Amino acid sequence: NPAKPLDGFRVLDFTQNVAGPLAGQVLVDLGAEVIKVEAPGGEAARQITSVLPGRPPLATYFLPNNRGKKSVTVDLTTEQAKQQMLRLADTADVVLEAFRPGTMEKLGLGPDDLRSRNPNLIYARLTAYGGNGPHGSRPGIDLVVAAEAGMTTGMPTPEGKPQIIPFQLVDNASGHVLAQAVLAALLHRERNGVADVVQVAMYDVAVGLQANQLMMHLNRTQPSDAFRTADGYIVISAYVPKHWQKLCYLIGRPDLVEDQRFAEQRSRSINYAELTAELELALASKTATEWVQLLQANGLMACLAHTWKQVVDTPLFAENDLTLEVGTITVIRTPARYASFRAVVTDPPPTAGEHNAVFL
Amino acid sequence: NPAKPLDGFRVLDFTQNVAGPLAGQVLVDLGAEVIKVEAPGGEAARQITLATYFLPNNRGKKSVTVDLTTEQAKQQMLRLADTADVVLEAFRPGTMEKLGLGPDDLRSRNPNLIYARLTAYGGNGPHGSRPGIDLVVAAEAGMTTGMPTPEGKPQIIPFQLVDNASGHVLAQAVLAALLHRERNGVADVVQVAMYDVAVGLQANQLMMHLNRTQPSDAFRTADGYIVISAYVPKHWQKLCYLIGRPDLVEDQRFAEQRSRSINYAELTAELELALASKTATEWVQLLQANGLMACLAHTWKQVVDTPLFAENDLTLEVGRGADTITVIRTPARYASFRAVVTDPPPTAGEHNAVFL
Numbered sequence A: 001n002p003a004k005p006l007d008g009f010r011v012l013d014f015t016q017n018v019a020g021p022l023a024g025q026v027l028v029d030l031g032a033e034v035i036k037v038e039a040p041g042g043e044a045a046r047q048i049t050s051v052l053p054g055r056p057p058l059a060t061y062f063l064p065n066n067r068g069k070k071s072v073t074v075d076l077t078t079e080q081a082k083q084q085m086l087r088l089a090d091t092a093d094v095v096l097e098a099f100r101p102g103t104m105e106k107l108g109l110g111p112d113d114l115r116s117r118n119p120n121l122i123y124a125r126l127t128a129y130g131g132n133g134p135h136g137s138r139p140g141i142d143l144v145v146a147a148e149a150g151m152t153t154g155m156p157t158p159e160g161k162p163q164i165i166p167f168q169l170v171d172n173a174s175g176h177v178l179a180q181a182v183l184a185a186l187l188h189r190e191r192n193g194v195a196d197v198v199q200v201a202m203y204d205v206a207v208g209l210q211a212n213q214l215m216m217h218l219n220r221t222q223p224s225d226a227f228r229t230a231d232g233y234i235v236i237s238a239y240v241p242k243h244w245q246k247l248c249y250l251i252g253r254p255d256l257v258e259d260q261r262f263a264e265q266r267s268r269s270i271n272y273a274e275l276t277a278e279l280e281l282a283l284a285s286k287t288a289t290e291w292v293q294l295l296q297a298n299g300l301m302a303c304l305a306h307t308w309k310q311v312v313d314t315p316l317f318a319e320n321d322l323t324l325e326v327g328t329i330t331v332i333r334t335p336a337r338y339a340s341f342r343a344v345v346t347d348p349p350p351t352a353g354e355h356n357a358v359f360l
Numbered sequence B: 001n002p003a004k005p006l007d008g009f010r011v012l013d014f015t016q017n018v019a020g021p022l023a024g025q026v027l028v029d030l031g032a033e034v035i036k037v038e039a040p041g042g043e044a045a046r047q048i049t050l051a052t053y054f055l056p057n058n059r060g061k062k063s064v065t066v067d068l069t070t071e072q073a074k075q076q077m078l079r080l081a082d083t084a085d086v087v088l089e090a091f092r093p094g095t096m097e098k099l100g101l102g103p104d105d106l107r108s109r110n111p112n113l114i115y116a117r118l119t120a121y122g123g124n125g126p127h128g129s130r131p132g133i134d135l136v137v138a139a140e141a142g143m144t145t146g147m148p149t150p151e152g153k154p155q156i157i158p159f160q161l162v163d164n165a166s167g168h169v170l171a172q173a174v175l176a177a178l179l180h181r182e183r184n185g186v187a188d189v190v191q192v193a194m195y196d197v198a199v200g201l202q203a204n205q206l207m208m209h210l211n212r213t214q215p216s217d218a219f220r221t222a223d224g225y226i227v228i229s230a231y232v233p234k235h236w237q238k239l240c241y242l243i244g245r246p247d248l249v250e251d252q253r254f255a256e257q258r259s260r261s262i263n264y265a266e267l268t269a270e271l272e273l274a275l276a277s278k279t280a281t282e283w284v285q286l287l288q289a290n291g292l293m294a295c296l297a298h299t300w301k302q303v304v305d306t307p308l309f310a311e312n313d314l315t316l317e318v319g320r321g322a323d324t325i326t327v328i329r330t331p332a333r334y335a336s337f338r339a340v341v342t343d344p345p346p347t348a349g350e351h352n353a354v355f356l
Helices: A019-029 A079-090 A111-117 A142-148 A169-192 A202-209 A211-218 A241-250 A265-270 A272-283 A288-297 A315-319 B019-029 B071-081 B103-109 B134-140 B161-184 B194-201 B203-211 B233-242 B257-262 B264-275 B280-289 B307-311
Strands: A010-013 A033-038 A050-052 A055-058 A070-073 A094-097 A122-127 A197-201 A224-228 A233-237 A301-304 A323-326 A329-332 B010-013 B033-038 B062-065 B086-089 B114-119 B189-193 B216-220 B225-229 B293-296 B315-318 B325-328
Touching: A010 A019, A010 A079, A019 A033, A019 A094, A019 A122, A019 A169, A079 A111, A094 A169, A111 A122, A122 A169, A142 A169, A142 A202, A142 B225, A142 B293, A169 A197, A169 A202, A169 B161, A169 B194, A197 A202, A202 A211, A202 B161, A211 B325, A224 A272, A233 A288, A233 B134, A241 A265, A241 A288, A265 A272, A288 A301, A301 B134, A329 B203, B010 B019, B010 B071, B019 B033, B019 B086, B019 B114, B019 B161, B071 B103, B086 B161, B103 B114, B114 B161, B134 B161, B134 B194, B161 B189, B161 B194, B189 B194, B194 B203, B216 B264, B225 B280, B233 B257, B233 B280, B257 B264, B280 B293
Parallel strands: A010 A033, A010 A094, A033 A070, A094 A122, A122 A197, B010 B033, B010 B086, B033 B062, B086 B114, B114 B189
Antiparallel strands: A050 A055, A224 A233, A233 A301, A323 A329, B216 B225, B225 B293, B315 B325
């Protein structure tokens, strides 16, 4: 019922898989009409399912990021689709595209093709590596882009194998950055009358996520770690003088405050190895849950390293109202929250080509 | 010279550390006037060196120095907010209210003011009231799951992904709010919790517990590891011929995609047997020439020197002539204007005279 930021805006979404569609989902949550353009028979990600005992399989990649969207089914190689897409684009505020560089141009749907017809059209491109040269022309997925951008650095594994982060951080981060860039473009148009071309590379996002560590190499705080306890590990960050002193008294080790090895913070960094040893000797007297309870009650930053299975059952997780029901299946909402409207949609994903008679 | 999306907008930035200032930096790049509010001595992050935390996210901002506990600074902030379009704040829940600078305090005076709050855990109740930093929020949101360590220690990701992702999400939400105000006349309160962002980055992994593909990994070679993803039927087949193992294509253990996943341990031994005859660099060259996804697992020291890194124009220089400092630009790019700034960070309190 209440107004949403993007009411009245129409988005043509050519993207597949996760990053581009998440950006589409963010736009939907903000009130835009987002029209998926899929290959005949539907997007391939519709078929990639996970087993749910006693129930139809769950399209774990497709369903969460295409709720409340509309769908047209079209074969982009034929002349008929080209014309339908050109007519559909004349009515659009935004085009979202995530093919590898050069594709849309070969189809006759490039930024120049579409923008010559519609001077108010915002054109947004998401690629793996940028399309700025020969090395950046390649297709990629999360796992390979993450590793090529350096995200395995400094994480030792038992076998000496590079550590591969087991969630799709580059995809999901890229989705939000693209959404950000579309929003900026919409504002640019609204205020200045300029309809822009926007480009986001997953590689650039990944580099950005590691910017501080990368920076030391562009130019030729303890205790803050996980620690053994009597039972399980505890994560503690207490390196600011007030917190550090507080910590030493709380674990029953006042001697550490004035120990010349640990008294100043720089000493804590140089003698970092000795410090974790002293802390773990002291932390041995309680379980991690007990230490977490004690340290938090005294205003120190500490927590358990929860597993995914544990996270979803914590009181904090329940408190933040992070889930929605899609008719039933449970999914996670987009992170940004607003007071004057709810940035969620209850609608299910569209069936493949559901709105062909409506838009073609 | 050319118009920028946020020309004419003024932002009041109370944020510290990485997450919030990154959002401010995006706003600067998009043309906004962003005014930092710092402690009298200057933000603490100015001193944590050389300055890996402060310099990259505060270029082109202006700076005022004030002690927020005093009534004089309180009044100065209230007058300044009367002129502002956006407030960015990243203290723990309840803090700004205690200073008399909460959303109702500021929005009562300025009905067009957008108020944006970045917290660690949300502030929606008792559990989400705590302060936090990247490392602790990441572990509490589940980001150590499924990563085995030599010593059995939980694996802590050594870069600030939750901070930097949160900044972009905040920037996104501020942009949405600006459009909301522009089109619907609503000046909103915006909230982004780092925990919520962290949950979102892991959404598919979390989702399996709310309701209920090979080869794609790193592999040993003669020298170094190679990362390969070739699990799609057409790609799987190409890989087998290129590494000299046509027998693997029809091998009952590996012929179907589901089989490769079940027998991934055997698959890995067979693949590494073949990959042992060449260096990782050699395999990357060969596999890419044939349209397969493969790369080295570069270190940070290596990434910066690659031809790919150079192609994408990812760095900018801060200062003039010699002894400039190199930083990384924000990722989104635009044709009608450059989302970059040359200007250096402000000195502590540099604009005290102009704003207070």
